[PDB]
Amino acid sequence: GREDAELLVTVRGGRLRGIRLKTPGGPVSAFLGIPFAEPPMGPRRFLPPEPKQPWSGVVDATTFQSVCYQYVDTLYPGFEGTEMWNPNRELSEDCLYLNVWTPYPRPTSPTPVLVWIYGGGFYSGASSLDVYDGRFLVQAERTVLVSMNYRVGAFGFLALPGSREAPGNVGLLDQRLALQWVQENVAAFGGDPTSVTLFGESAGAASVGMHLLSPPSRGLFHRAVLQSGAPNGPWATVGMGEARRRATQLAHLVGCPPTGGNDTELVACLRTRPAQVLVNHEWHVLPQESVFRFSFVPVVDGDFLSDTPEALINAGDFHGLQVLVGVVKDEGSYFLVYGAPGFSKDNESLISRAEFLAGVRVGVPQVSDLAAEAVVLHYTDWLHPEDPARLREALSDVVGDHNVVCPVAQLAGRLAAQGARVYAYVFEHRASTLSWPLWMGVPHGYEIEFIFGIPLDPSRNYTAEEKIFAQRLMRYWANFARTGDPNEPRDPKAPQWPPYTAGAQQYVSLDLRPLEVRRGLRAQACAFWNRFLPKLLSA
Amino acid sequence: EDAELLVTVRGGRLRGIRLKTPGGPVSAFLGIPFAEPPMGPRRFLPPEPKQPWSGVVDATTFQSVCYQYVDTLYPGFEGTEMWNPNRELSEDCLYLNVWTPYPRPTSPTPVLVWIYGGGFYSGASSLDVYDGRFLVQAERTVLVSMNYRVGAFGFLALPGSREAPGNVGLLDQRLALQWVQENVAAFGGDPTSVTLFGESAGAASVGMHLLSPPSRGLFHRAVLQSGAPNGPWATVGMGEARRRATQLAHLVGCPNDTELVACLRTRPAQVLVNHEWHVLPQESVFRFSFVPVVDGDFLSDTPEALINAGDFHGLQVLVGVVKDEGSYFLVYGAPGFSKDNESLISRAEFLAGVRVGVPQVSDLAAEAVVLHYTDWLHPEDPARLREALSDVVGDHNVVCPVAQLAGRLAAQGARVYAYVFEHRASTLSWPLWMGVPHGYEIEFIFGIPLDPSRNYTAEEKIFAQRLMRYWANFARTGDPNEPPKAPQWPPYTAGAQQYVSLDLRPLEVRRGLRAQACAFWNRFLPKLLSA
């Protein structure tokens, strides 16, 4: 024969050829590596994305395109638990491509669209990672799934505020441009541009929240899912002057200029540097040795973010909005092996009291001694001030509460109070295949594989109940995408997932057991982080 | 004539009185003068030793109560009147009391010295609840208690002035302790075995004698009940003492320290009492206008500083608290509280209550209190707020200062025994929501339940006897414990933090005197106020 028409689609820019993916449940059509911007190369480094200019002929969207230039983790080389996050395509600045999965055959009526935004501290990540494989969600729940690559590290987020040549936030604009692409083009794949649900994890979740808070993005989607991240986390944004300080120190460390001066001259010198040279020096600009702190991140400069995310969260009217938010059970453990004294994946990490107090300064960097003392007060058990196992769990809680749990809780409660229907979860199942040690519990990032249905992959060795569990979670996420309500339409018997409200603060546990409702996302701890500590930092 | 009731002490001769108890008689010598009356020109001055007398002093009845405010919040209510003066008020009040077995012991008997509480503004040794006859009969100790000057009369200070140097009420206690050293042997008491015990301001007083070298050679062991000398209420700085004494003068029509004290000395005692409470810098509970002053003399440094620097090897102390130290105080100022309803307060009242119960701190410090004591799963529940604010007041003022004293003394060489008193008296007239309130272990320590004319249960009498035995064991040996079989009371240490609960059940050993809450008060909040 000839050509597969289901695999042929015309978008505003030109024609595309896709590929038919086998899944355990049947075929899916995948359009992988669709260009959506001009390559941000050479003179276009650090600049906002330019829309992809139209093309003649057929573009093959048949495999994932390159990973945006980024650091590659070397802490445990060859270890599955870290390698799963590392680039699985070649690094290149030529990386602004998105992916579309759709049912085979293409839907007749408009189908709601899930749009994935990966995390990775804004310095890493890619849409090609095996655990963001969209084929299982699309087959199981008959949605359209979109994911995009966006620039990370200095390439996405180096900012010399006020400058035209490095305005900052261009990685967020990469995401915005892809969302505009979804609006203009998703119907051609059978998706509904009036039913678009963003969802992302860690920095992706923070990205999702920033699109909520930036009006030009807010009009591009209808619902949001924020997994283990929030735009108000202490790591997710930086002020203008500290952004400038980091950009300036980065340039200085790579010989630009031959410090400060003309912004045009400085960025021009930065543009002559090999991408890898920039990546090799990114961590050097951090004010102190820390965990959960990233050099180049969204900048609060009045443009993309008119105010800080907390301010915008407090001031916002969120009627008409449904949001699904949540955390894993042990948000903090993963980060401790990257700098906290006494921690390793390869032993029990039974730290001393002196190591705990040292880790508090690593986990809560750039706060006053008084503030550090307030942290030690809350997280020490004063009947057991020096018990190693309790100190290990307490430091894990410090990092997790500070960076994920309490930012998410503050977002959830404010949105609920101000007119949004919110649903909250804690993900509590520890995968049978997890390669991290037992003391880390359910670490940051390890709900994703279940949301995407990865246990359905024959090549993998999950249990049959984990496959049931994944199917349950895919159904929740897609129910929320379709209706703004994760609850399965007309099915009593099966326990209900209640909305999260600022008063009752109800959420559900996600594990192999049926839904269990509980109260308070670490309420006592998050009162310290969200109500008291900010007052101390003022005074 | 009963020769057992005739005693000669250094200043002359005394006639006592035989008292009855359900266990037999006791000899009592009540109203023994130990100082010259601190009247007229001697007001605000250190006490002077009583000059010798001829004849026989009548020592058969309690002497006058030192001038003091009389509580009026619930007139005629038993729970308040039991602390009010039960003899006439007079500045001529420096008398002490000796209770002794009958017949008087003929070999040296260990001595307990009782120092009453009352916020340094009130109290008397004549109160029914301090009646020494049951302890002396049951445990065969000599018991001494003294009256000391309270309020402005005892503690008004213009620091550096000699007309009103301050702390003279503490000097009243010291003089009585000197009197015990010189004269207790004439009653069968052993001056080499003197145990001080006291409650609230009396416990703070005990601790202060621990920390003042001239008092320290006058006793051997110490018992601190529901009080400590490092309590935020127990001492006052020089500048604030001078401000308070200066505002009292103005409030009573008086204008140089000499001319100021002179004018104060012309005023009827009741006039000073009437304005006493108005020199406090803000509306509060558990704060008292005229208290011991830190001025380098009696206390060479703050009690906190003195506690941290001290070598306490060879010291044994018994310390403890009641289950609900804060509840009693909430009806004297906390919005929404009353003994006559459930005191189910609002979140708003709770927050207002925090500034009453933790007065004179920054808003940030108050915020920190509100954070620690809010249940953020139930931020507005009235019952929890009532209990939380009682915890705030009780932890801040009693529990955590006592916990701090205990841990520092233990880690610096002392042998410490700690208790929580958890029995609610079947006769208690305060409401159920107050639990076991401040002060209501005393009647059990003094064996009042043994009084047949009172309405205690059979087990309550046995309980009182256990308590009297612990206390007198501690006085005799530095150790409240008895031969084994019975559950043992272990020493409190900074690490293990062990204490026993005292109730109708056998001793139960537990860990931590509100260690989580007391870390806040003892470790974090000082750092906050520094910044």
Ligand SMILES: *[C@@H]1O[C@H](CO[C@@H]2O[C@@H](C)[C@@H](O)[C@@H](O)[C@@H]2O)[C@@H](O[C@@H]2O[C@H](CO)[C@@H](O)[C@H](O)[C@H]2NC(C)=O)[C@H](O)[C@H]1NC(C)=O
């Ligand atoms: C647990 O491991 C940490 C991390 O050390 C690494 O992993 C270990 C399994 C072992 O192979 C070490 O050699 C590795 O370097 C241990 O803390 C380190 O200790 C070494 C030497 O004592 C020191 O040079 C490092 O700086 C330490 N790392 C820190 C402080 O982050 C820790 O002692 C181990 N705990 C045990 C064995 O109980």
Ligand SMILES: *[C@@H]1O[C@H](CO[C@@H]2O[C@@H](C)[C@@H](O)[C@@H](O)[C@@H]2O)[C@@H](O[C@@H]2O[C@H](CO)[C@@H](O)[C@H](O)[C@H]2NC(C)=O)[C@H](O)[C@H]1NC(C)=O
């Ligand atoms: C519980 O009582 C307090 C105390 O109020 C007094 O005692 C009561 C038993 C009753 O006799 C009241 O009339 C007395 O005023 C109540 O708090 C008072 O509330 C009134 C308003 O009615 C207010 O004007 C007073 O200022 C309040 N006093 C204080 C000290 O805050 C409280 O409302 C009662 N709780 C109830 C009724 O649930």
Ligand SMILES: NC(=O)c1cc[n+](COC[n+]2ccccc2/C=N/O)cc1
């Ligand atoms: N040399 C650098 O630019 C650099 C960049 C990022 N990090 C972050 O460290 C790794 N890490 C730290 C914490 C959690 C995950 C990971 C894995 N990233 O691939 C270190 C150095």
Ligand SMILES: NC(=O)c1cc[n+](COC[n+]2ccccc2/C=N/O)cc1
């Ligand atoms: N001399 C006075 O004017 C005066 C007024 C009030 N008080 C204290 O009475 C309140 N009170 C009485 C008994 C027990 C506790 C309390 C509260 N303390 O903060 C003492 C003196």
Ligand SMILES: *[C@@H]1O[C@H](CO)[C@@H](O)[C@H](O)[C@H]1NC(C)=O
């Ligand atoms: C930087 O230098 C370029 C090169 O001539 C010039 O055009 C530009 O105006 C300069 N910018 C500033 C802010 O001085």
Ligand SMILES: *[P@](C)(=O)O[C@H](C)C(C)(C)C
């Ligand atoms: P978040 C800090 O953006 O990223 C975590 C580490 C990851 C699992 C890589 C997405």
Ligand SMILES: *[P@](C)(=O)O[C@H](C)C(C)(C)C
């Ligand atoms: P404390 C503050 O001295 O309390 C006294 C002893 C009482 C009258 C019992 C409240």
